[PDB]
Amino acid sequence: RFLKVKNWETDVVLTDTLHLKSTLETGCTEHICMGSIMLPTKDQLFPLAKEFLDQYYSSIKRFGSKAHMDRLEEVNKEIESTSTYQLKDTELIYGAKHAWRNASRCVGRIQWSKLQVFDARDCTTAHGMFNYICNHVKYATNKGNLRSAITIFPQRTDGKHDFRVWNSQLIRYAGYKQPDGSTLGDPANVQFTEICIQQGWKAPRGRFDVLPLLLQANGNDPELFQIPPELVLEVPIRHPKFDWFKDLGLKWYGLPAVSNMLLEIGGLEFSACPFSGWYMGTEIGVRDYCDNSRYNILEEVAKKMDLDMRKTSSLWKDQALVEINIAVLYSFQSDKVTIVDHHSATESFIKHMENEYRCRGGCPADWVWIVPPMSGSITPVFHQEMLNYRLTPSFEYQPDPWNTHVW
Amino acid sequence: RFLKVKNWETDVVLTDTLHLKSTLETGCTEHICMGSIMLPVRTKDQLFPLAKEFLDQYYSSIKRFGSKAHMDRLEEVNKEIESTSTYQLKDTELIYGAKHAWRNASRCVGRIQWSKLQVFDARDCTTAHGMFNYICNHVKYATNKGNLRSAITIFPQRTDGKHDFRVWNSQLIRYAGYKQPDGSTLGDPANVQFTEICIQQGWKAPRGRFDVLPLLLQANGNDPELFQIPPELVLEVPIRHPKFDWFKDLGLKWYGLPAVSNMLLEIGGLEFSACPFSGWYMGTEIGVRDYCDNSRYNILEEVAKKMDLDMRKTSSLWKDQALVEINIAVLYSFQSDKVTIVDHHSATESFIKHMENEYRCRGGCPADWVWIVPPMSGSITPVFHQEMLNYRLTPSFEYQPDPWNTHVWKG
Ligand code: HEM
Ligand code: HEM
Ligand SMILES: CCN(CCc1ccc(NC(=N)c2cccs2)cc1)Cc1cccc(NC(=N)c2cccs2)c1
Ligand SMILES: CCN(CCc1ccc(NC(=N)c2cccs2)cc1)Cc1cccc(NC(=N)c2cccs2)c1
Ligand SMILES: C[C@H](O)[C@H](O)[C@H]1CNc2nc(N)[nH]c(=O)c2N1
Ligand SMILES: C[C@H](O)[C@H](O)[C@H]1CNc2nc(N)[nH]c(=O)c2N1
Ligand SMILES: [Br-]
Ligand SMILES: [Br-]
Ligand SMILES: [Zn+2]
């Protein structure tokens, strides 16, 4: 019930107690482990509200103070009366930072406390949402010196008035199914690209077309908007040894910004909460570029490198993978856009885990996601045992809005 | 209840009913997942249910379920248990049993091969010399001059837990490790403790970087004894690279037969505490883990210096570059010397075909993702994109404590 995690490379043992706060469920049982599965009223509200306010007042060392009790009473009255409640700004910021803190799939959490929070709970229209988003994009990009931020739109009410950003990220490239049977651009986004097209977006039909924003305020039909191109920092992909690399015509965007998740603070649901930090190199170089169902470029790169593609045992895929990833890192660095390599990031995350064990009594962590998708065992996180469990405040998945929305 | 797993590259969705037969516990609850934790005498009482269930499975597999032959076996095992407190497996049931423990091994990527396993029955063995003899035959049969064949050798089962058969070595063939006075290690650091026990026990150590350890063998609960495997029986492969001629000069080699000797085989409640098994290597076991773990041979820096890579910053991916070259070298060397080896692309693809087949014919395939995904190039192997259900079936291979931790010394 008090649990140990061993690092097998260093022999460091940490004891976890934080897990006994865990509220939500895992998907696992005594009989079956689901560790590798991607997707495992008033009466409900006050327990959640109290639990949250309890940890908040404890975090500022006012647990059991009149001010703590007072607020608990105030929120309680508000629920009884209104059937919801409003977070004070301080609680909103704390809620947000802690949802990041608690994200067991995020390797980048050593940074969790420095999050910039933009309160957009006063927003009412998709145009308003567009303005808030552009401000977020500009603030976060910061000419390439990227800064973490989240923008928080109004919370769910009756569920027929949801704020949603339909995009999966604020900045992503379009995907077009072609007569040839194949795909141009990013195949991950073919469906959303079609929803933009049927909405009225004139598509340049290129390999790297920045998608429009499809923004939904107060449960209305969503509206198209183009992000000013001056706000979208992009990096041309070259290699520091291979001259021909640039001829592949590869680029990526500097700002990863997740816009389809749901933020839960003290029972309150924020269905539009775009957040952004910066890239770990492998996301682009391993996953975006090399996934068979993404840009899938390994074949082409291997050719240009003139490697023996006749047998899998030459490790030509492996060779090409490394080079592609050297180039991503090299390009971002050359252009002065913040990026982290998988070595540095996993080293940080070990140091973060340590702090959290010492300061919090633990750190929920999902090994399957935390281990980078290349060179697993030569990064320290591979050798590190991790306990995975669900703490609130949290980010959660929610269905793609077009399966839900009533037009 | 039906459980679905999805492959996110192909959208193939499979359905699992086999987890329904899962008895043992995972280490997880509804509130915690322990999916990355490395390690998460029986009385008459619990023995007969374990026996029955196993014999029910065995007789189902041979399409004799509910037969006269089935019923009589059940009754005979039952009589034998309560009379003697244990029971003896028939040859056919032992064979079926060992094969299933491999089939059920959720951490094993090489399971496509499960039905071709040579079972050697060493239950008539009584002494350490007898064990040495069975193990040589095993090593020679499995080696097969480089055309590796899977085999397991099964020594007598546990009785009162005071007469255990054990192989003290963790693999039959493995290199010594020697902690030096300056705090450095010579040879394989994973094997320092076992190496010191061998020295204590009287092994005169050559003290090089690649000394094949002697066998330390425990028969019948007696103090273990030392034996050297005939060198002519130990197939080894010098490691060279197909383009970098200085690679050979690093002085690396590895042995060709990987043979695990420290696990416990459980069949119908019976515990076989010495059951060495062998197959062949996936290249990354040597190239990634044995060569490049910081706590093992740790050659990344020396390799990368020799390749004159930029070592001043990790974002040069010097480590990742060196790692690929080492792994090419490992596979090239084995293939050139005609020693069976499999690369991680080829073995993960076979595993996915194995797994789909297992779903269709068997109704499932317990698989531990943390273990199945290779320790380099994860997402360019199809297993990374495969969802897996992990659960424990019997027969099974289990961990057991190192014998020096439990053994009662006689003198
Ligand atoms: C500061 C730089 C950051 C780095 C380098 C970083 C790194 C990562 C990486 C590599 C993933 C895996 C993504 C994937 O494979 O799809 C991830 C997942 C996640 N990150 Fe972080 N992160 C950072 C900042 C943040 C911030 C600011 C938040 C929220 C405020 C956050 C919340 C999450 C969540 C919720 C997931 C899981 C997404 C999912 O389950 O689909 N990240 N992060
Ligand atoms: C045919 C050749 C084989 C290949 C290429 C293969 C591949 C592997 C690999 C790569 C591992 C992970 C080892 C590690 O990281 O420590 C493994 C684990 C395992 N394999 Fe297989 N294997 C093969 C044959 C067999 C045989 C014949 C058995 C037993 C009959 C077996 C049972 C297991 C077990 C019990 C584990 C888990 C070890 C542990 O949990 O510590 N393997 N196998
Ligand atoms: C919610 C989407 N996440 C990725 C979220 C994400 C988080 C982090 C990053 N990278 C970053 N560096 C940051 C982004 C924001 C701050 S840091 C990028 C993306 C991927 C995901 C998770 C679970 C399931 C799926 N499902 C799917 N792949 C599909 C849906 C439909 C067809 S396939 C995708
Ligand atoms: C029981 C030993 N296994 C390795 C077993 C193994 C299985 C398979 C192979 N490789 C093969 N290809 C085959 C061997 C036999 C048939 S196939 C090699 C080894 C490793 C292990 C498992 C669980 C805990 C530990 N604990 C440990 N002591 C450590 C691990 C790392 C640093 S210390 C070790
Ligand atoms: C099936 C498996 O759960 C799935 O492919 C996971 C594995 N690990 C991952 N890890 C990260 N960081 N991101 C991912 O999308 C995935 N996908
Ligand atoms: C902590 C973690 O579970 C541990 O390092 C595991 C990870 N995956 C592994 N996978 C395999 N095949 N072999 C291993 O030794 C390990 N080690
Ligand atoms: Br980071
Ligand atoms: Br195989
Ligand atoms: Zn689990």
Swiss-Prot record, chain A:
(6R)-L-erythro-5,6,7,8-tetrahydrobiopterin binds at residues 36, 368-369, 382. Isoform N-NOS-1 is expressed in brain and colorectum. Found in the Auerbach's plexus of the enteric nervous system. Isoform PNNOS is expressed in the penis, urethra, prostate, and skeletal muscle, and coexists with the cerebellar nnos in the pelvic plexus, bladder and liver, and is detectable in the cerebellum. GO terms for biological process: arginine catabolic process; behavioral response to cocaine; calcium ion transport; cellular response to epinephrine stimulus; cellular response to growth factor stimulus; cellular response to mechanical stimulus; establishment of localization in cell; establishment of protein localization. Heme b binds at residues 106, 397. It is found in: Cell membrane, Sarcolemma; Cell projection, Dendritic spine. GO terms for molecular function: ATPase binding; cadmium ion binding; calcium-dependent protein binding; calmodulin binding; enzyme binding; flavin adenine dinucleotide binding; FMN binding; heme binding. Changing residue 279 to H: 50% decrease of nitric-oxide synthase activity. It comes from the Eukaryota. Keywords: Calmodulin-binding, Cell membrane, Cell projection, FAD, Flavoprotein, FMN, Heme, Iron, Membrane, Metal-binding, NADP, Oxidoreductase, Phosphoprotein, Synapse, Ubl conjugation. L-arginine binds at residues 169, 278-279, 283. Ubiquitinated; mediated by STUB1/CHIP in the presence of Hsp70 and Hsp40 (in vitro). One of its GO terms (cellular component) is secretory granule. Belongs to the NOS family. Produces nitric oxide (NO) which is a messenger molecule with diverse functions throughout the body. In the brain and peripheral nervous system, NO displays many properties of a neurotransmitter. Inhibitory transmitter for non-adrenergic and non-cholinergic nerves in the colorectum. Probably has nitrosylase activity and mediates cysteine S-nitrosylation of cytoplasmic target proteins such SRR. Inhibitory transmitter for non-adrenergic and non-cholinergic nerves in the colorectum. Homodimer. Interacts with DLG4 (via N-terminal tandem pair of PDZ domains); the interaction possibly being prevented by the association between NOS1 and CAPON. Forms a ternary complex with CAPON and RASD1. Forms a ternary complex with CAPON and SYN1. Interacts with ZDHHC23. Interacts with NOSIP; which may impair its synaptic location. Interacts with HTR4. Interacts with SLC6A4. Interacts with VAC14. The PDZ domain participates in protein-protein interaction, and is responsible for targeting nNos to synaptic membranes. Mediates interaction with VAC14. This is Nitric oxide synthase 1. It comes from Rattus norvegicus. The chain holds residues 299 to 716 of 1429 of the full protein.
Swiss-Prot record, chain B:
Ubiquitinated; mediated by STUB1/CHIP in the presence of Hsp70 and Hsp40 (in vitro). L-arginine binds at residues 171, 280-281, 285. Isoform N-NOS-1 is expressed in brain and colorectum. Found in the Auerbach's plexus of the enteric nervous system. Isoform PNNOS is expressed in the penis, urethra, prostate, and skeletal muscle, and coexists with the cerebellar nnos in the pelvic plexus, bladder and liver, and is detectable in the cerebellum. The keyword Oxidoreductase applies. The keyword Oxidoreductase applies. Keywords: Calmodulin-binding, Cell membrane, Cell projection, FAD, Flavoprotein, FMN, Heme, Iron, Membrane, Metal-binding, NADP, Oxidoreductase, Phosphoprotein, Synapse, Ubl conjugation. Heme b binds at residues 108, 399. GO terms for cellular component: azurophil granule; calyx of Held; caveola; cell periphery; cytoplasm; cytoskeleton; cytosol; dendrite. (6R)-L-erythro-5,6,7,8-tetrahydrobiopterin binds at residues 36, 370-371, 384. Signal peptide: none annotated. Its main location: membrane. The PDZ domain participates in protein-protein interaction, and is responsible for targeting nNos to synaptic membranes. Mediates interaction with VAC14. This is Nitric oxide synthase 1. It comes from Rattus norvegicus (Rat). The lineage of its organism: Eukaryota, Metazoa, Chordata, Craniata, Vertebrata. The chain holds residues 299 to 718 of 1429 of the full protein.
